[PDB]
Amino acid sequence: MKDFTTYLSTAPVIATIWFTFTAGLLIEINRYFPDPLVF
Amino acid sequence: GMLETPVTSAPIVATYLSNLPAYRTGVAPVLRGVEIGLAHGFLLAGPFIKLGPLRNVPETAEIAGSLSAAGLVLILALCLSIYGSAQFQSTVARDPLFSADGWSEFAAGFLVGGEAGVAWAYVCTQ
Amino acid sequence: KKVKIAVDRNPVETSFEKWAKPGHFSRTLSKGPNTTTWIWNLHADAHDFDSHTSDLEEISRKVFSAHFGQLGIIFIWLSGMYFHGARFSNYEAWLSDPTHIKPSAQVVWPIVGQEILNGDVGGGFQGIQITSGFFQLWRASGITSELQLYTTAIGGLVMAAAMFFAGWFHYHKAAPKLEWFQNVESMLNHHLGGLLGLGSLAWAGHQIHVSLPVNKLLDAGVDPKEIPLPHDLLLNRAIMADLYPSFAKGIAPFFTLNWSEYSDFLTFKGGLNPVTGGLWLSDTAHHHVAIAVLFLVAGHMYRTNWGIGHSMKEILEAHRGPFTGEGHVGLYEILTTSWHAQLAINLALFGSLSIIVAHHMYAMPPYPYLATDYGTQLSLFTHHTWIGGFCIVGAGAHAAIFMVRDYDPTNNYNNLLDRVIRHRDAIISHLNWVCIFLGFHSFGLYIHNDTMSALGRPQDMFSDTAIQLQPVFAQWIQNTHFLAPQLTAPNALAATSLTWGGDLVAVGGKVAMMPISLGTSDFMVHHIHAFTIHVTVLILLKGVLFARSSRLIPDKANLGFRFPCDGPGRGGTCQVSAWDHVFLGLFWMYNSLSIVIFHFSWKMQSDVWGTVTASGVSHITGGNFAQSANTINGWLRDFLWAQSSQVIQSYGSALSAYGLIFLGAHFVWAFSLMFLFSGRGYWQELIESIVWAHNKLKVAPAIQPRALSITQGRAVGVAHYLLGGIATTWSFFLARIISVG
Amino acid sequence: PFVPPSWAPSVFVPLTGLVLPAIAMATLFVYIEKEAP
Amino acid sequence: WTVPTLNPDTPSPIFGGSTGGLLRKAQTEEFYVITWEAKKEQIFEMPTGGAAIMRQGPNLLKFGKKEQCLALTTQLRNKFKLTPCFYRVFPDGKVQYLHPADGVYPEKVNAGRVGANQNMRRIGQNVNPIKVKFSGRMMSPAEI
Amino acid sequence: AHIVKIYDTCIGCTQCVRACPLDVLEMVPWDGCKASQMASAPRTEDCVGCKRCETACPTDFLSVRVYLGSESTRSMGLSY
Amino acid sequence: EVGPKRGSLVKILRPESYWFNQVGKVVSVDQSGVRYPVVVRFENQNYAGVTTNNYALDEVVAA
Amino acid sequence: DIAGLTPCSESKAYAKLEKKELKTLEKRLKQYEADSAPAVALKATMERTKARFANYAKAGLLCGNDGLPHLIADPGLALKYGHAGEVFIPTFGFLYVAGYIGYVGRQYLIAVKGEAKPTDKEIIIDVPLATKLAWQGAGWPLAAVQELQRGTLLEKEENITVSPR
């Protein structure tokens, strides 16, 4: 399990998870707050 | 060392190449030029006559084609002269064609033979 | 001598320990990164199995397991296509109206205004119009409901799981030995008989029992819900006997050599189905039956464990003439010990086959309602053509890899390969001359036509009205094929295709297939294709023959297959490696295939595709190919400028995405020019200044930033060039063919 | 007046386009390949 | 040790010929001849392309440039552990011994060799090009 | 001909001589390093300028430098 | 005894060196009259992939 | 108002564009049923368009002759005519998030630089340390100002490598 977690801690896996989280957050924000142009 | 094949080692092609004027090795260069020029001008007159811009107009297609072939022969003669001037500048038996005087005489013979071949090809179509 | 199953038990232990140690496969990469170059190297040598170790057995085991992983990926992709057709498509509605409803199998979520991409494809459905042709393929197989597609998707997922399990089992539990992989005779016997023959026989059985009755009822006008299920057709002989009377006799005429009785479902109709526009399914079923018998016969040629059969080594050694020295001696050992040589041969034939598939598929449409779907036809032809060209370039690359790594002069003293390498100078010089001759006599005609047209002299151009260059050989071949069913094909009811000649076949008011005439423009574009293919062959062949040595660098083989250069010496030795020859061959392949697909698109939209009216056929472009394809200006104005209108004004509609990609593809391609025209020295110095700014703020990474290598720069540039150009043509073709076709 | 004749282009254009460049190219070609003593 | 003399009557390895051999430069400018001793008949790879068979004893070959001769020398030394040597032959018949120049291979130091083109300073100690400007021709600061 | 220069930072590792494909460099006795050897370029007329010697040099900065000079038949590596 | 202590950290003062103004560990110092007796090993490799170099007594400073 | 523009709530081209978008959506909707998925999706798109136009007009945006909103980037004009929500507040928002990311990355590099193999930590991310630094990066402006005032933000010129000029 330690080796598997270390593999999950590698740069491509971490980048994939982080970008999926960031993209999901932005998509959900644009979904609940459609068409945001100004503050 | 080198690669030998029946194409480059057949006696028939060797005899055919030796019979050509360029590989005579012993005749005057002006005669070689006259022969080569005639053989070239005769074939050169064809494309300009049958494919030039005046190929459809009658009584002038052959005139324009022959004049164009004559101009091409003149350009080729000038090319031969400058080649001889820039190739032989210093220094079996040695062929006299590969020399300044030999190549100059060869170019002059080529010019005379080419113009005669063009003129002969023009009258051959009449 | 004995063909058996040789397998080693548990050679590699299944663990995650190596998953946390990147670059473990390479001895140089296992140390760890110090510079950013290492990262790129980690991906550039991941599949270079022969570079990790010199053991042929380990390389073969890795290749075999990698093949299983690839098959699992393919099964996942196919399962996804079936799932999308079963849950996010309009296949059921398209079945009741395939001539008006546009096929669609992709729906987008209503986010950031992208819902506009869900166009009105018909049948009360909103989505993206697909061009893969899965609807026509499913209709040809007899699929009438989404449940069948869903079941096929689940089966595909199960097959993918089995493929991945097979790869793991064959790499960690039961790994085959080297002698098992070297059984080329047994492998060829099985692949010919078992795989190909049994697959053709099984597909013939499905076509005879499912595709033929379901499609017969579909063409007869029966609703898909009223058509009996395939198992109902396979369970009783009454329904099949009513649809095909020969089924009343069972399998008895097959064993009594009364095959002529089965003429109701095994025919030689030829031509196309006037109802659907595709090939007759009885002809395809009979075709698969004949293919199965032929391949099953071919699968009993090689010697495996008994006296009967052939030894490929003996056959190769027996072929020797007086003009080739020894002959095929050593070829059996080369193909049984080098994976790169086999990959080169397989990639070359595979790419050629893909191109042949594209041609045969547009000319003889085998699926129902496929010919009238101009978008699917154009997309299928273009896609298969590109795959074929890429595989051909890869074949040249692997031939060069074999010549650099696996070539051995001690086994090639006077063979065919030895003599080819001995006269490589003559081969390359003659190919260079023929390339120059073809280039002049192909491009100069267009330049001459452009000049004559601009000078106000259309009578001096190379056109049909003026001086013409008619393809008499192609026209004679076309006439021969058109007249074949009356003299040289007494049992054929019609010709193989309608492109040779005859009447046109139209489905739903659209021309499915009509004769294709060849003129001066066709002659010129064919010579253009020949010239481009010859130049691509010249670059790839030069990179393969001169991969080990040349008159410039006598020890090129010592420098490897993929190296940037040998310094600025000898005037400059930039791009001397075989890798660089493949790099240039990719550009030439792109040029060749792009002109090929452009010619296909213009010819089909000008003389084949179009609508059918009262006493006349109106084409998409109005038949302007014969008059405008003889000049470069005609290709730029009538084909590129005129047809790009659909992709540039696609904004605000469902095809707007194509327009966006049309712009994005112009970016990536231009992006490629930054990597192809520059050198890494400039970028390294620029990185030095950026590293200085980072060191000033204590944000300099431990892994030293290095510019991309010379080879990596060339690879990135060619990759972006190919992606941008192909994506540009893809967006333009799809938008135009969907809007006007 | 300095006005050239009507036949001036028919003589100067072929001259500058074919006679002068041929002479210039021939003289330059001979000069480039001349060997130093 | 004494400088060897070229033996023109030396057998050449068994080779069927190729198109990557000598050209007009060998007959008008110069060419190179490599000779070596082989303990047995063995198949080797020609630097100009192809596979030849070196015979037992003396072996002589001709090449168009010195790089081909040194490439063959490297191949014979690293693979078959031989000791080849080559010369530069002119059309007039002059023979000039080239490698190993002093009888000992240059990778190993040998007595009697006089150092040439050695700068008794480092690269960072080179002067600026302005101090070398307006010289006889294009001169780099490392040349002084 | 190209200009090949050897500097005093040479450690006498003989890697540049082994990497030379036209036998331009050699080793001469010296006393400025532990190896007691120094690289030399007595046959620069045969140098082509491939810069393999610079690639094989381990000193920082390089101890051998090749400056491309006049071009001839030998320096251009022409076999014709 | 001449030169820096073995195992100590020094700063490179050679301008043309890749590790100029960088810290490196001292490996060994030659006791003869060689031009560059100090041997310095670095954690970051240069463009050629080398991690060690030779420097003079005045080209290294204890930093 | 500013630069001769007019508010979007009074622009005729703005209302005309809204009517045009609703007209094309209604035209596409006229070909479907009244209780189907495409009808519901088109109605949702129409409601989103109406809400977007009303929200843009309610925000006080300025529209040009084309009927499209125009942003004000000058801080004086934005703060004087109530346009700070266009370019000012998003500017500071981006500055906060960007400096957040940069500070967290810099802290991670400084933290792993004192270990045995910093490159190993650069390719294999230490998730606990990265998460702790990501959570602690909320006070990045205060911490950055303190680092700049103490002189520990920059590195000395003698410790940075340079070319031989």
From TrEMBL, chain B:
Gene Ontology annotations of biological process type = photosynthesis
Q: Does the keyword Hydrolase apply?
A: no
Binding annotation for chlorophyll a 1: Y16, A22, H40
Provide the protein's localization.
Membrane
Look up keyword Cytoplasm and say if it applies: no
Q: May I have one GO cellular component term?
A: photosystem I reaction center
Task: Tell me the keywords, alphabetical order.
Answer: Membrane, Photosynthesis, Photosystem I, Transmembrane, Transmembrane helix
Q: Where does chlorophyll a 2 bind?
A: Y16, H40
Give binding positions for chlorophyll a 3: A22, H40
Residue ranges spanning the membrane: these are none
| Record's bilayer topology term | Multi-pass membrane protein
Where chlorophyll a 4 binds, per the record, is at: E35
Photosystem I PsaL reaction centre subunit XI domain sequence ranges: 1-126
The record's family statement is:
Belongs to the PsaL family.
Name under which the protein is recorded: Photosystem I reaction center subunit XI, chloroplastic
Organism equals Chlamydomonas reinhardtii (Chlamydomonas smithii)
UniProtKB/TrEMBL annotation, chain D:
- The reply on keyword Membrane is yes
| Presence of keyword Repressor | no
Query: Could you tell me the keywords of this UniProt record?
Result: Membrane, Photosynthesis, Photosystem I, Thylakoid, Transmembrane, Transmembrane helix
A GO CC annotation recorded here is: photosystem I
Compartment list = Plastid, Chloroplast thylakoid membrane
Q: What's the chief localization of this chain?
A: plastid
Going by the entry's taxonomy, the superkingdom of the source organism is recorded as Eukaryota
Give the UniProt record's GO annotations in the biological process aspect.
photosynthesis
Q: Which family does it belong to?
A: Belongs to the PsaI family.
Give a short account of what the protein does. Answer: May help in the organization of the PsaL subunit.
Entry protein name: Photosystem I reaction center subunit VIII
UniProt source species? Chlamydomonas reinhardtii
